Amino acid sequence: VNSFSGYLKLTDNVYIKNADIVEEAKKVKPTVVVNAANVYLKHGGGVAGALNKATNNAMQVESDDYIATNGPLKVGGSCVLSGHNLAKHCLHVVGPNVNKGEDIQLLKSAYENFNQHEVLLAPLLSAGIFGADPIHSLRVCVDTVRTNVYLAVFDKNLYDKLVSSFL
Numbered sequence: 001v002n003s004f005s006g007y008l009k010l011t012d013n014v015y016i017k018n019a020d021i022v023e024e025a026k027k028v029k030p031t032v033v034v035n036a037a038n039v040y041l042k043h044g045g046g047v048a049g050a051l052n053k054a055t056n057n058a059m060q061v062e063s064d065d066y067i068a069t070n071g072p073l074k075v076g077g078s079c080v081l082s083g084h085n086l087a088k089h090c091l092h093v094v095g096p097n098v099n100k101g102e103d104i105q106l107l108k109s110a111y112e113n114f115n116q117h118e119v120l121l122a123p124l125l126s127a128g129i130f131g132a133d134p135i136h137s138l139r140v141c142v143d144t145v146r147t148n149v150y151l152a153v154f155d156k157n158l159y160d161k162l163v164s165s166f167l
């Protein structure tokens with residue numbers, strides 16, 4: 001039993017809710033919140049900008065030190081950093097950005113990072129400003145992640161379309 005509330009169950013291990021991941025993170029305090037990161041950990045907009053703003057820019061300060069030490073992430077890769085006031089940890093995962101021409105096949109590699117964590121609160125990778133089809137992202141998620149994932153979908157219209165078209 002866990003503290004996630006109001007989710008629709010899609011499969012054995014994947015759950016979905018129309019929610020603001022920032023508000024869900026602050027209420028739930030999950031062990032892991034996933035950020036929709038880029039390779040430079042520049043949290044300017046979309047989910048990353050929202051999560052970073054909610055940390056009063058502490059996420060960005062920590063991220064800049066991470067990059068200065070380690071260099072950029074790989075597309076499809078991840079790193080674990082602090083969750084600040086939102087979660088125990090933040091898993092920064094880089095899905096491919098279609099608006100940069102990155103290979104959508106790397107979306108599966110991106111979701112594989114979730115399997116290193118027993119339970120996660122997450123957005124749909126490569127959705128939103130990353131330019132992928134969210135229906136496809138949900139399919140890749142369901143077919144790749146084996147751990148327990150609670151997906152927060154900000155847009156109600158998109159949430160209803162994801163549920164109603166789910167196979």
Ligand SMILES: O=C(c1ncnc2[nH]ccc12)N1CCCC12CCCCC2
Pocket residue numbers: 019020021022046047050123124127128129130134152153154155158
């Ligand atoms: O739904 C979300 C989303 N999901 C969870 N937490 C969130 N926080 C802030 C936004 C947000 N996003 C993020 C990028 C674009 C998109 C997907 C595509 C349709 C517009 C909205």
